[PDB]
Amino acid sequence: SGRRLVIVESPTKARKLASYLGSGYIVESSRGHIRDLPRAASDVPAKYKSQPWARLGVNVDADFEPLYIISPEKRSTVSELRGLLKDVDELYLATDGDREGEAIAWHLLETLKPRIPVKRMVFHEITEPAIRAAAEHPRDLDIDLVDAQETRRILDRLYGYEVSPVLWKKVAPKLSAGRVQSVATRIIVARERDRMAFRSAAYWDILAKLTFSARLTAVAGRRVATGRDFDSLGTLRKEVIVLDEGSATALAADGTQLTVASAEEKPYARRPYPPFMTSTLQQEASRKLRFSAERTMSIAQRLYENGYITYMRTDSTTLSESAINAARTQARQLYGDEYVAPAPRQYTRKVKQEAHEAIRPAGETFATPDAVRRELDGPNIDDFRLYELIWQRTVASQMADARGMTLSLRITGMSGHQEVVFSATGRTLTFPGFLKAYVRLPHLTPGQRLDIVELTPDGHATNPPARYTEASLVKALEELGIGRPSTYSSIIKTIQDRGYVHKKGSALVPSWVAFAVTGLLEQHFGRLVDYDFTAAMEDELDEIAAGNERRTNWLNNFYFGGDHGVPDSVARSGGLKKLVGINLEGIDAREVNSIKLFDDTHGRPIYVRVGKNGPYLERLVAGDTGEPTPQRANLSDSITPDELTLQVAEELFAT
DNA sequence: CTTCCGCTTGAC
DNA sequence: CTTCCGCTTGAC
DNA sequence: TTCCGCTTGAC
């Protein structure tokens, strides 16, 4: 007797906490969520199989009563916890303090149904003072907090399981829509049609080698066309003139000394990158150290388990006072006194107390990489490389700005009856910056002699905006407040599984069905796919957790419509049920599955139709008899949407 | 018959 | 052996 | 269906 069972969200924290407690405590992990709604009507128990609300898994007619089942991938976890409950005398529900962690603790209470005393406690780190403080300040469950995420969970269920049937009815079966999916897909589709309407505009100049390289700036009274001078349609924004291949080569002129007009100097200040999070660490790990994303996490798990770094899964880049002081104290003693900022540098992000902290070395006194190189070697060399990378960005984030000086020279030259202008930009490091840990001659008096050695016609062309990658997409989602670190990787795979997005190298390319689904949701569910929907939802979830709004009243307004309570976008417009009801009856399916692109020379529209065997290009044309018998050509995925111009449209029709 | 977001990957 | 291609990030 | 950077430089 006299033993306690402590349950944590993550197996890693479970192992590290078990190392600090010893006997008398049994530390286990819930592997995240143990319960969920049924994914299908065939998953509900036999009591509610006939009830009409079984497809949703919540009884929206009876105050949105949810139906929870043990997740099949967590039955092994649940059965172990139930078995270990019979061997202890107290239960410590020590999940995370966020609304997801509070609901896991709530689900653990409901699933275990313990007959022994239960205490709810939260900690932010695995250290003896953090464990002691959490143990000497327990509390009960926060139902307003569990009602917050339950409202979120049911919100996502209503969104997905009610709007997806509309897609099956108007586009294709098995298609889906989600508060994150449909927005993440829309981000990619919006990028694609931005480069379908994009039109290029080429221009030339001269970038000659007058260890120095100068470029064209102006020619006589006018300037030279730069990349920042043309809009999306190839139109020059209203003075300058584009030097083409013919005119620029005529101004090539043999060897002539060039003058110098200006050589002013002015200093700059370079800022250090903020500390690492789970997202920004894998980027730099795959770049300067050539590690995989799963290889970085696997290594980062062991460094944290040995007390080298902090927790790996963090959407926060802030530092604690103990960390901000240890980094500044170590930096000052390591290098110099003037090598630090006057005040500590705090790097805070959005979705503001976020219990999560940046990935940084552990302890109130940081350990140099030199100190751990003697301890990490052999088959542990890969571990030391990640620590040095983590230690470097943590101490460099607390040192004084890197100061340099840029020299903006201005080279001069003549050419017949036209005074052309040249210029070039240089830069040199004058102050030893944060880069020390990790991150001929350029002197010229105004009016010197410098002959032209090389000469070349610089060929240029404006380029469409680049496609999103996995890194850049989750960045756009982060700045919008969409998604979570645990779902970022998952949401990328899900939008590929149903054929919304395929990958070409590192770029994410949307399929044609993504265009059709986005068009439906933009023209008929405009509020559900608004980029601001999740943020406005989060603001309303704050009021439910704060006690200023009940879960049932909010859901009743969102689904059935309502003006009373916290104001909601879909609620004041009649609710979700009325919106999916009207769209199931008023949407012309023959119109939403025909993606309009352009007209050909005969002025007739060409569509992309989403058929049962993939997309196919279709066009209506007069046939043998003067009637609108039509033309189709099956559309292979080998050509992206922006590549489908009028030519290849006619080349497929000529096939 | 489809369909959602979210949560973790220890060693008994 | 004799076979081939989205340039993305982000300086200051 | 083997394997892949740097130089310009968004702001």
JSON list of N, CA and C (backbone and C1' of nucleotides) in Angstrom, two decimals, chain A residues 12 29 33 80 152 157 174 181 311 313 486-487, chain B:
[
{"chain": "A", "resi": 12, "resn": "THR", "atom": "N", "xyz": [7.29, 10.53, -22.83]},
{"chain": "A", "resi": 12, "resn": "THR", "atom": "CA", "xyz": [8.60, 11.08, -22.48]},
{"chain": "A", "resi": 12, "resn": "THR", "atom": "C", "xyz": [8.57, 11.71, -21.09]},
{"chain": "A", "resi": 29, "resn": "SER", "atom": "N", "xyz": [1.54, 7.16, -18.90]},
{"chain": "A", "resi": 29, "resn": "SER", "atom": "CA", "xyz": [1.17, 8.10, -19.94]},
{"chain": "A", "resi": 29, "resn": "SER", "atom": "C", "xyz": [-0.17, 7.72, -20.54]},
{"chain": "A", "resi": 33, "resn": "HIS", "atom": "N", "xyz": [-5.01, 11.75, -26.09]},
{"chain": "A", "resi": 33, "resn": "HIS", "atom": "CA", "xyz": [-6.43, 11.49, -25.87]},
{"chain": "A", "resi": 33, "resn": "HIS", "atom": "C", "xyz": [-6.69, 10.00, -25.79]},
{"chain": "A", "resi": 80, "resn": "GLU", "atom": "N", "xyz": [-4.17, -0.86, -19.44]},
{"chain": "A", "resi": 80, "resn": "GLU", "atom": "CA", "xyz": [-3.04, -0.82, -18.53]},
{"chain": "A", "resi": 80, "resn": "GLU", "atom": "C", "xyz": [-3.31, 0.09, -17.34]},
{"chain": "A", "resi": 152, "resn": "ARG", "atom": "N", "xyz": [-15.18, 23.06, -28.70]},
{"chain": "A", "resi": 152, "resn": "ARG", "atom": "CA", "xyz": [-14.31, 23.03, -29.87]},
{"chain": "A", "resi": 152, "resn": "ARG", "atom": "C", "xyz": [-14.42, 21.68, -30.58]},
{"chain": "A", "resi": 157, "resn": "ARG", "atom": "N", "xyz": [-16.73, 18.56, -35.16]},
{"chain": "A", "resi": 157, "resn": "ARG", "atom": "CA", "xyz": [-17.54, 17.43, -35.62]},
{"chain": "A", "resi": 157, "resn": "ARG", "atom": "C", "xyz": [-18.72, 17.92, -36.46]},
{"chain": "A", "resi": 174, "resn": "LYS", "atom": "N", "xyz": [-16.84, 10.66, -50.85]},
{"chain": "A", "resi": 174, "resn": "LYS", "atom": "CA", "xyz": [-15.67, 10.47, -49.98]},
{"chain": "A", "resi": 174, "resn": "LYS", "atom": "C", "xyz": [-14.90, 11.76, -49.74]},
{"chain": "A", "resi": 181, "resn": "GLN", "atom": "N", "xyz": [-8.67, 21.74, -42.69]},
{"chain": "A", "resi": 181, "resn": "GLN", "atom": "CA", "xyz": [-8.49, 21.21, -44.04]},
{"chain": "A", "resi": 181, "resn": "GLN", "atom": "C", "xyz": [-8.88, 22.24, -45.10]},
{"chain": "A", "resi": 311, "resn": "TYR", "atom": "N", "xyz": [11.62, 20.38, -23.30]},
{"chain": "A", "resi": 311, "resn": "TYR", "atom": "CA", "xyz": [10.66, 19.61, -24.07]},
{"chain": "A", "resi": 311, "resn": "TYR", "atom": "C", "xyz": [10.72, 20.00, -25.55]},
{"chain": "A", "resi": 313, "resn": "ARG", "atom": "N", "xyz": [8.24, 19.36, -28.14]},
{"chain": "A", "resi": 313, "resn": "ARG", "atom": "CA", "xyz": [7.00, 19.79, -28.79]},
{"chain": "A", "resi": 313, "resn": "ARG", "atom": "C", "xyz": [6.54, 21.09, -28.14]},
{"chain": "A", "resi": 486, "resn": "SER", "atom": "N", "xyz": [0.73, 19.33, -33.23]},
{"chain": "A", "resi": 486, "resn": "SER", "atom": "CA", "xyz": [0.45, 17.91, -33.41]},
{"chain": "A", "resi": 486, "resn": "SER", "atom": "C", "xyz": [-0.37, 17.62, -34.66]},
{"chain": "A", "resi": 487, "resn": "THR", "atom": "N", "xyz": [-1.07, 18.62, -35.20]},
{"chain": "A", "resi": 487, "resn": "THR", "atom": "CA", "xyz": [-1.89, 18.42, -36.38]},
{"chain": "A", "resi": 487, "resn": "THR", "atom": "C", "xyz": [-1.28, 19.00, -37.65]},
{"chain": "B", "resi": 1, "resn": "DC", "atom": "O5'", "xyz": [-21.83, 0.01, -45.71]},
{"chain": "B", "resi": 1, "resn": "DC", "atom": "C5'", "xyz": [-22.02, 1.23, -44.99]},
{"chain": "B", "resi": 1, "resn": "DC", "atom": "C4'", "xyz": [-20.98, 2.26, -45.40]},
{"chain": "B", "resi": 1, "resn": "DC", "atom": "C3'", "xyz": [-20.95, 3.52, -44.55]},
{"chain": "B", "resi": 1, "resn": "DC", "atom": "O3'", "xyz": [-19.82, 3.48, -43.67]},
{"chain": "B", "resi": 1, "resn": "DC", "atom": "C1'", "xyz": [-20.70, 3.97, -46.91]},
{"chain": "B", "resi": 2, "resn": "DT", "atom": "P", "xyz": [-19.20, 4.83, -43.04]},
{"chain": "B", "resi": 2, "resn": "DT", "atom": "O5'", "xyz": [-18.26, 5.37, -44.21]},
{"chain": "B", "resi": 2, "resn": "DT", "atom": "C5'", "xyz": [-17.84, 6.72, -44.20]},
{"chain": "B", "resi": 2, "resn": "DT", "atom": "C4'", "xyz": [-16.99, 7.02, -45.42]},
{"chain": "B", "resi": 2, "resn": "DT", "atom": "C3'", "xyz": [-16.41, 8.42, -45.44]},
{"chain": "B", "resi": 2, "resn": "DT", "atom": "O3'", "xyz": [-15.16, 8.41, -46.11]},
{"chain": "B", "resi": 2, "resn": "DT", "atom": "C1'", "xyz": [-17.92, 8.17, -47.24]},
{"chain": "B", "resi": 3, "resn": "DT", "atom": "P", "xyz": [-13.81, 8.70, -45.29]},
{"chain": "B", "resi": 3, "resn": "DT", "atom": "O5'", "xyz": [-14.03, 10.17, -44.69]},
{"chain": "B", "resi": 3, "resn": "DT", "atom": "C5'", "xyz": [-14.29, 11.26, -45.56]},
{"chain": "B", "resi": 3, "resn": "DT", "atom": "C4'", "xyz": [-14.91, 12.42, -44.79]},
{"chain": "B", "resi": 3, "resn": "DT", "atom": "C3'", "xyz": [-14.29, 12.67, -43.42]},
{"chain": "B", "resi": 3, "resn": "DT", "atom": "O3'", "xyz": [-13.32, 13.69, -43.52]},
{"chain": "B", "resi": 3, "resn": "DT", "atom": "C1'", "xyz": [-16.72, 12.84, -43.41]},
{"chain": "B", "resi": 4, "resn": "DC", "atom": "P", "xyz": [-12.09, 13.76, -42.50]},
{"chain": "B", "resi": 4, "resn": "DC", "atom": "O5'", "xyz": [-12.58, 14.78, -41.38]},
{"chain": "B", "resi": 4, "resn": "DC", "atom": "C5'", "xyz": [-13.13, 16.04, -41.76]},
{"chain": "B", "resi": 4, "resn": "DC", "atom": "C4'", "xyz": [-13.37, 16.92, -40.54]},
{"chain": "B", "resi": 4, "resn": "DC", "atom": "C3'", "xyz": [-12.11, 17.24, -39.74]},
{"chain": "B", "resi": 4, "resn": "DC", "atom": "O3'", "xyz": [-11.65, 18.54, -40.09]},
{"chain": "B", "resi": 4, "resn": "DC", "atom": "C1'", "xyz": [-13.81, 16.30, -38.31]},
{"chain": "B", "resi": 5, "resn": "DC", "atom": "P", "xyz": [-10.08, 18.89, -40.04]},
{"chain": "B", "resi": 5, "resn": "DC", "atom": "O5'", "xyz": [-9.78, 19.09, -38.48]},
{"chain": "B", "resi": 5, "resn": "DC", "atom": "C5'", "xyz": [-10.29, 20.22, -37.81]},
{"chain": "B", "resi": 5, "resn": "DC", "atom": "C4'", "xyz": [-9.95, 20.17, -36.33]},
{"chain": "B", "resi": 5, "resn": "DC", "atom": "C3'", "xyz": [-8.46, 20.13, -36.01]},
{"chain": "B", "resi": 5, "resn": "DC", "atom": "O3'", "xyz": [-8.16, 21.11, -35.02]},
{"chain": "B", "resi": 5, "resn": "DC", "atom": "C1'", "xyz": [-9.60, 18.39, -34.87]},
{"chain": "B", "resi": 6, "resn": "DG", "atom": "P", "xyz": [-6.64, 21.47, -34.65]},
{"chain": "B", "resi": 6, "resn": "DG", "atom": "O5'", "xyz": [-6.31, 20.47, -33.44]},
{"chain": "B", "resi": 6, "resn": "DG", "atom": "C5'", "xyz": [-7.10, 20.52, -32.26]},
{"chain": "B", "resi": 6, "resn": "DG", "atom": "C4'", "xyz": [-6.87, 19.29, -31.40]},
{"chain": "B", "resi": 6, "resn": "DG", "atom": "C3'", "xyz": [-5.41, 18.94, -31.14]},
{"chain": "B", "resi": 6, "resn": "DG", "atom": "O3'", "xyz": [-4.97, 19.51, -29.92]},
{"chain": "B", "resi": 6, "resn": "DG", "atom": "C1'", "xyz": [-6.82, 17.00, -31.47]},
{"chain": "B", "resi": 7, "resn": "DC", "atom": "P", "xyz": [-3.41, 19.63, -29.60]},
{"chain": "B", "resi": 7, "resn": "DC", "atom": "O5'", "xyz": [-3.00, 18.19, -29.05]},
{"chain": "B", "resi": 7, "resn": "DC", "atom": "C5'", "xyz": [-3.39, 17.78, -27.75]},
{"chain": "B", "resi": 7, "resn": "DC", "atom": "C4'", "xyz": [-3.00, 16.34, -27.49]},
{"chain": "B", "resi": 7, "resn": "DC", "atom": "C3'", "xyz": [-1.63, 15.95, -28.01]},
{"chain": "B", "resi": 7, "resn": "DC", "atom": "O3'", "xyz": [-0.63, 16.26, -27.03]},
{"chain": "B", "resi": 7, "resn": "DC", "atom": "C1'", "xyz": [-3.27, 14.22, -28.41]},
{"chain": "B", "resi": 8, "resn": "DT", "atom": "P", "xyz": [0.93, 16.19, -27.41]},
{"chain": "B", "resi": 8, "resn": "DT", "atom": "O5'", "xyz": [1.27, 14.63, -27.38]},
{"chain": "B", "resi": 8, "resn": "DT", "atom": "C5'", "xyz": [1.19, 13.91, -26.16]},
{"chain": "B", "resi": 8, "resn": "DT", "atom": "C4'", "xyz": [2.01, 12.63, -26.23]},
{"chain": "B", "resi": 8, "resn": "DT", "atom": "C3'", "xyz": [3.27, 12.71, -27.10]},
{"chain": "B", "resi": 8, "resn": "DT", "atom": "O3'", "xyz": [4.33, 12.03, -26.44]},
{"chain": "B", "resi": 8, "resn": "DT", "atom": "C1'", "xyz": [1.97, 10.89, -27.76]},
{"chain": "B", "resi": 9, "resn": "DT", "atom": "P", "xyz": [5.85, 12.51, -26.63]},
{"chain": "B", "resi": 9, "resn": "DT", "atom": "O5'", "xyz": [6.31, 11.83, -28.00]},
{"chain": "B", "resi": 9, "resn": "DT", "atom": "C5'", "xyz": [7.14, 10.67, -27.98]},
{"chain": "B", "resi": 9, "resn": "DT", "atom": "C4'", "xyz": [6.32, 9.43, -27.65]},
{"chain": "B", "resi": 9, "resn": "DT", "atom": "C3'", "xyz": [6.99, 8.10, -28.03]},
{"chain": "B", "resi": 9, "resn": "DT", "atom": "O3'", "xyz": [6.69, 7.11, -27.04]},
{"chain": "B", "resi": 9, "resn": "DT", "atom": "C1'", "xyz": [4.92, 8.28, -29.13]},
{"chain": "B", "resi": 10, "resn": "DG", "atom": "P", "xyz": [7.59, 5.78, -26.92]},
{"chain": "B", "resi": 10, "resn": "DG", "atom": "O5'", "xyz": [8.91, 6.27, -26.14]},
{"chain": "B", "resi": 10, "resn": "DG", "atom": "C5'", "xyz": [8.80, 6.77, -24.82]},
{"chain": "B", "resi": 10, "resn": "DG", "atom": "C4'", "xyz": [9.93, 6.25, -23.95]},
{"chain": "B", "resi": 10, "resn": "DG", "atom": "C3'", "xyz": [10.33, 4.81, -24.21]},
{"chain": "B", "resi": 10, "resn": "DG", "atom": "O3'", "xyz": [11.65, 4.57, -23.73]},
{"chain": "B", "resi": 10, "resn": "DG", "atom": "C1'", "xyz": [9.07, 4.97, -22.19]},
{"chain": "B", "resi": 11, "resn": "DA", "atom": "P", "xyz": [12.48, 3.30, -24.24]},
{"chain": "B", "resi": 11, "resn": "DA", "atom": "O5'", "xyz": [12.14, 2.16, -23.17]},
{"chain": "B", "resi": 11, "resn": "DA", "atom": "C5'", "xyz": [12.61, 2.28, -21.84]},
{"chain": "B", "resi": 11, "resn": "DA", "atom": "C4'", "xyz": [11.90, 1.31, -20.91]},
{"chain": "B", "resi": 11, "resn": "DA", "atom": "C3'", "xyz": [11.74, -0.12, -21.46]},
{"chain": "B", "resi": 11, "resn": "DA", "atom": "O3'", "xyz": [12.23, -1.06, -20.49]},
{"chain": "B", "resi": 11, "resn": "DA", "atom": "C1'", "xyz": [9.69, 0.68, -20.61]},
{"chain": "B", "resi": 12, "resn": "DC", "atom": "P", "xyz": [11.84, -2.62, -20.56]},
{"chain": "B", "resi": 12, "resn": "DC", "atom": "O5'", "xyz": [10.41, -2.68, -19.83]},
{"chain": "B", "resi": 12, "resn": "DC", "atom": "C5'", "xyz": [10.09, -3.77, -18.98]},
{"chain": "B", "resi": 12, "resn": "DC", "atom": "C4'", "xyz": [9.37, -3.28, -17.74]},
{"chain": "B", "resi": 12, "resn": "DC", "atom": "C3'", "xyz": [8.51, -4.32, -17.04]},
{"chain": "B", "resi": 12, "resn": "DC", "atom": "O3'", "xyz": [8.58, -4.15, -15.63]},
{"chain": "B", "resi": 12, "resn": "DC", "atom": "C1'", "xyz": [7.16, -2.50, -17.70]}
]
